[PDB]
Design a protein around this ligand. Sequence first.
Ligand SMILES: CC(C)(C)c1cc(NC(=O)Nc2nccs2)n(-c2ccc(CC(=O)O)cc2)n1
Ligand SMILES: CCCCCCCCO[C@@H]1O[C@H](CO)[C@@H](O)[C@H](O)[C@H]1O
Ligand SMILES: CCCCCCCCO[C@@H]1O[C@H](CO)[C@@H](O)[C@H](O)[C@H]1O
Length: 335
Amino acid sequence: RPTFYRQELNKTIWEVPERYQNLSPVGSGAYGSVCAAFDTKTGLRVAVKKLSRPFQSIIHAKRTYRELRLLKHMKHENVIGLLDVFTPARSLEEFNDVYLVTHLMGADLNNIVKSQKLTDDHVQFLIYQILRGLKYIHSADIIHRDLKPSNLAVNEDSELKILDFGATRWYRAPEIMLNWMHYNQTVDIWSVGCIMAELLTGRTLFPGTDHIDQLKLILRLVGTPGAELLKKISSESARNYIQSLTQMPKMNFANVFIGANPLAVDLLEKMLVLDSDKRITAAQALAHAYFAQYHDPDDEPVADPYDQSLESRDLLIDEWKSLTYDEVISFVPPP
Ligand SMILES: CC(C)(C)c1cc(NC(=O)Nc2nccs2)n(-c2ccc(CC(=O)O)cc2)n1
Ligand SMILES: CCCCCCCCO[C@@H]1O[C@H](CO)[C@@H](O)[C@H](O)[C@H]1O
Ligand SMILES: CCCCCCCCO[C@@H]1O[C@H](CO)[C@@H](O)[C@H](O)[C@H]1O
């Protein structure tokens, strides 16, 4: 067992191994809080997440277990991975707090586009990495669901990792916003399209003021649902309502992307398709000519399959807690 020390951070006492130094809050929410830190044992800048009352409720306990399991599973250059997980507890009976440690990287994509747009060459490298990470995540039968610039961590050399800390709706696929009976991994490709567009233009693609505005903006770029897609919407009244959200024909798509690489625009047109069944997949996108400088079919690895049964489980807090404890004590750090 490492030696721990205690300090007050974000209104609670954080108790962490002495290797972790210079803890500085960077974000907080209902589910927990995150500090930037320096890991003196590895010389790495790290993020340390303390879960907020991880076993207070069934939902908190389930989310705690899910996050630990997922992070333990992810072993890919472009996906955030677990560097460490710890608890100050010495037994299950005293187990009450969980801390997760990941690479910090140093910045996110929420920053770089404020003053000016990125070069096409830069966008190639950034989106290539997002898609490479996403191919991996999707291959594990995991849907991200909240891809956005603040969930994309980048270092000074623009090496990128996808994370989920756990403006808000600007990158969301329309079907998530419209409570589709089911949706699938194609929602993340929509998000990549929105992100890529923004890097190229320096501006948010669909900056909706609210839910309906968001949908109207989307419909104005990509067009009202066509005949094939309309068949996939059950409600007559819903289809009638849709037909009111547009008053003019759709625009020339390319007008948003003046002077852009034609291959970039072609890829964007293939990502930003209203009908999710028709969107390009991560694997297909990696093979698109836009990424010729980076694509290597032998260096775009896939994930071991993931036991996702626990996402639909209805369990007692103490079961989620015991399952989580097992995962904490069995953790082995990466080489
Ligand atoms: C693997 C990928 C990107 C999908 C991913 C990464 C993370 N987590 C993560 O990045 N944590 C970090 N800590 C510190 C720095 S980055 N989650 C995630 C999984 C589960 C839940 C719980 C819920 O579902 O609410 C929350 C987040 N998913
Ligand atoms: C804004 C009003 C129109 C929104 C239409 C979004 C259609 C999204 O695409 C739909 O995704 C569903 C979930 O994966 C699939 O079941 C459907 O087959 C697919 O057409
Ligand atoms: C643009 C705002 C108006 C949106 C109207 C379309 C709402 C689509 O409604 C959706 O249709 C799906 C397919 O039938 C169902 O599976 C979803 O449960 C339903 O929410």
